[PDB]
Amino acid sequence: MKFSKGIHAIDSHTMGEPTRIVVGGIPQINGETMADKKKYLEDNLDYVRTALMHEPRGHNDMFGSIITSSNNKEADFGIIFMDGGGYLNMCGHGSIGAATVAVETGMVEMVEPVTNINMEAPAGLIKAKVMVENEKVKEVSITNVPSFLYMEDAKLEVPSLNKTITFDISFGGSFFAIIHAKELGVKVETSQVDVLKKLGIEIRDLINEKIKVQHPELEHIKTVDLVEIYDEPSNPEATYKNVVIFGQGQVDRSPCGTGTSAKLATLYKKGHLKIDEKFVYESITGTMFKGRVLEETKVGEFDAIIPEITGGAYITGFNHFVIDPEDPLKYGFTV
Amino acid sequence: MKFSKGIHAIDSHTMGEPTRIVVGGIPQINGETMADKKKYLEDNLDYVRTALMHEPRGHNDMFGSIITSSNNKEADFGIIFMDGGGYLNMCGHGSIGAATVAVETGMVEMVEPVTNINMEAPAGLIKAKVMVENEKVKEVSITNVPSFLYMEDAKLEVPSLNKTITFDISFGGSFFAIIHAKELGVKVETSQVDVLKKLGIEIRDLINEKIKVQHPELEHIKTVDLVEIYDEPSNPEATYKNVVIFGQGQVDRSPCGTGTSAKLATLYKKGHLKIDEKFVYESITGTMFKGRVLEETKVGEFDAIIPEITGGAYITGFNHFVIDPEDPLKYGFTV
Amino acid sequence: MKFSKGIHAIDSHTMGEPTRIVVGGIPQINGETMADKKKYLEDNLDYVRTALMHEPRGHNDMFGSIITSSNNKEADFGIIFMDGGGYLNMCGHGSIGAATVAVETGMVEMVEPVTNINMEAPAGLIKAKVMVENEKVKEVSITNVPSFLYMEDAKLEVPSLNKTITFDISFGGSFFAIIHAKELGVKVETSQVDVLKKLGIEIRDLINEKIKVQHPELEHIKTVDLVEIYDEPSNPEATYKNVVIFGQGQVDRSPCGTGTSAKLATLYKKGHLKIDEKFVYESITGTMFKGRVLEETKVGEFDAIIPEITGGAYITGFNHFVIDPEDPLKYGFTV
Amino acid sequence: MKFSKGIHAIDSHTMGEPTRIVVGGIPQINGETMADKKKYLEDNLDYVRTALMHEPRGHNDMFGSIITSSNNKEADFGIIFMDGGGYLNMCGHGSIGAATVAVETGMVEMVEPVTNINMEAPAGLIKAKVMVENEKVKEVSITNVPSFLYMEDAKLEVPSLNKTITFDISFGGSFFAIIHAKELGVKVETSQVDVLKKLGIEIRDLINEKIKVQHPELEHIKTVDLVEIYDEPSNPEATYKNVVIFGQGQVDRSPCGTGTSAKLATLYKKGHLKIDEKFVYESITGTMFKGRVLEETKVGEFDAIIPEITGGAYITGFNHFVIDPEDPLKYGFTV
């Protein structure tokens, strides 16, 4: 058996959304800042992303992260989020899995009450309170980048079909479009996952074509990579169901940590939330994250908030991914 | 890290369609015959299938197989095909993967012109000619179960939409419905993969409600588990594009071996194919299989054929698939 | 990367003495009875034994076991013991290792109070009582082949040096040469391990040359493959320290199992033990086994006993062992 | 299954002498310089070394290296040798292993004529020319620290037995005590490996007690951690047989790399070698290295040489090493 290249990685799941965490396939990535490290990857080893996020090794949806050398102070190691599309600037389910697994494997040397983990992440730092119940990780409270309301509703226009009106956009690590499922008239359920998909991505794009997308700091992002559609929850707990469309038409199985932290900055600046006050966000599956607002913060030029998301991940296998250099799909394909 | 259970299994890929080959999770499966080993599994360890085929470990589509102690004469080891749906009686892409990887890992001590592998399978035996080019596996000619035309056009009736007419059915390890893409007016392409998927499974069901499905021997099958839609290829090589829908609404990335070994028996009995005479089947991807008729044979009560399917697989990972017994999805979910 | 072959195996350790258990690197081995499997191996795939037990993948000492398809009734799977030297007919630390790991990995589904495991082995059957503490394997009570006192002392003659006298020989799966460390004047300790080693294998040999070695039943063993030297323990618990020399001049880091089961018979028939009554055996490391006599039995011609040995193993790694066909030592070497 | 920590590491062998290369069990180790890393390890995670290099996982002899983050310029990654004893400051077998595998696995993207690798190491930098035969790694020319003749013969005194005279000492990364096998009267063979072992360490020690051991530069080594014994080769090729004793009484299955780079400096400065001119060194196994002198250099105070050692490693298995926290020998033991 010829192979050439051999990638080691840990398959987790945070609330059903898969994270595949890379470990040993490369010993070294320079980058410098954790946005530079991401750019390096993208413009150099995209072939690793595609190979592992696409078929045949992965699938549409499917999601993963690289565990780096940090460079940074305070932060243990550094995280680069990747997907079937590209490289997400920030990801809650990801952050969760990463941390869960770091401790689990004992890459971190675990502390009993809780374990604090400071990770890099392309967009600012992140900290994860990792509850451990003597023996196990019980769950994880990640505290996120400054999230905020961006552009108050704003008119939308959707060619297919009708050309509707109101919807809000907000940051939370990336830029989410938050639109209500009544607004376009979708049922945030298994039924329509694909119509949701094509609806989401079609909005994302024609939103990305003709808008002002900009962070008044970090000055790189300037994109609406994400579409959150939400509606009343058919679970008793949780304040809403959301589904989150992203990366070349994929859909999150979790409520999307970055999507909840964004949504929390677009309550609050609305009134319907006070600092703390348990938020719970329902996904499109039957799974739920325990969000809440922590503090106030005016980012660069306009008011904002720093929110705390609280999920939990499980280990679902170890891989030695390999590529037979004959395999004419050795760097993977889509559909 | 607590884990309780630990499954060893090699990811492969025949022509795009994944085959996840199980190796070392269990050291015993009694069954007896390779239909009695499939029942055992079905009724007992189904938890294995679901866990591996279904998220978060696998996906909708996705496919695999258990390498088993043989019992049988001639045959080396014994195969059991499993899928997002259930336990396919026979599968080419799988038999290909299973052979490729048996040799490639040196479970089979490789012979240099070609290696002959006799595998069990739920429906009859199968022999793989394995072409090895000093070092590597170059490709695989699998010679399939007796295929044959079964019924002939016959009544159709599709509620959504219109209620059309002609279409054929035939056996090639499993019972295929072979209906032209003009017949229901679908384009066998990426575009519509999903409408094809819901179309396929709806026909497969309402066809299985009101028909005569029966193999005159083996006397267990009696089902139309599969829907082959075909049309003129938009690849210069290959006689037709086919797309195969099966198991709980999933689609084969390959042309389907059993689908091609079926569709060969329902030419020939048609005139448009002489014994030998290269058939090439284009999948729904861009991939192709080199099929061709080998010999004549009347099965039990009616005339038939024994076809040869020729493809090729690649290794794409080694896994220690583990279940955290805290992982509430530890046996996996659908959508 | 280029490898041809790829063995799966799990590294354990039973009271320090390593047991490497083989899993996935073959799906079949015919043999028939768990002596005819051992002969098949010995006289066909010795190149597995040497490759794993010898350098550069194993070492002097080192020990391992093959998990097989059973064939037999009652018995789950089947075990084949192998060492630097050859294939050991029965081993306690092996049987322990094998059982602990079977359950732990979930190749056996675990039963809560205890799990019973019936394993084949090249000398009879063996049953392991697997104590599981809700979650974990606590330890293991293996119940062992009819042990007995064979040949009352008998004179030894040792060239280097002097030429001494008394020492006894027994059976407990294999034939043990029990001799007191005061008899040859050795200190069963770290200090002299190697003089013990060479003293042992010289006795074993020149004993094997000029004696009557015979089991009245099974009629294949007829060998003294083992040398047990014992003295007053410098651990408070345990009735003695023993060290066990075997297979091409290696030494057992555990008290040995088969060696303890042997020695128990040759108390008892001595008067210094009553059915039950805790025996504890100290190794040549600081590690201990909990042995005790279960019931009487006169084997074929002469009186005997059936003993129980109690220990506990730990997992120390997972291996995808591979052989680069260019690696001139692919099948390994000794010194 | 329950496991505290999970270490990814690749087993190799350079000319029979094992090198176990760590990969993924950690993502970080601060240190700073590839000495200050080695110290950090030595005075913090000596529980890694001992676990892996000692039983039950490793053995007496046995050896392995850590692949690090570099910090340094030019150099890809960084290397930390480790052995049954401590942490070798430089080692040929290692630097070879480490390079062979880095390319072979595709951690380095391979260049066809030869790949150049710059690795850190505790003692300076090293560069490896890695010869790749289109597909494979054929062999590896590592260029080594300025070697030299230190102290002309000097009288030894050996208590067991007689008390002999002449023997030289040199540097090649570490300080080698080169003495002829006629000098003490030992046959550098299998027969006496253990008398050689105990002779070596006893010399190494009583040499370290009463001598002047000093590098004029780097100012941290000041030790004779190595004992080379050499004699006429009973292999046609190779100028001499040497066996190399080090680290807590272990023996080197290769000729030693550092031990050859040393010995080369103490020919040459002797007149029996001209710049280039193939030197070949035989090991205490039948195995050889292709050494030669590259260029002159007077280190700090006294004359010297920079040599080039040429060998070739092979992968022998992939490990997920795991420690059951119950495993009382979790951190491993000696004898």
Ligand SMILES: O=C([O-])c1ccc[nH]1
């Ligand atoms: O889980 C999340 O935070 C996420 C990021 C992108 C989609 N979901």
Ligand SMILES: O=C([O-])c1ccc[nH]1
């Ligand atoms: O290629 C095949 O054999 C197959 C079976 C089911 C789907 N494809």
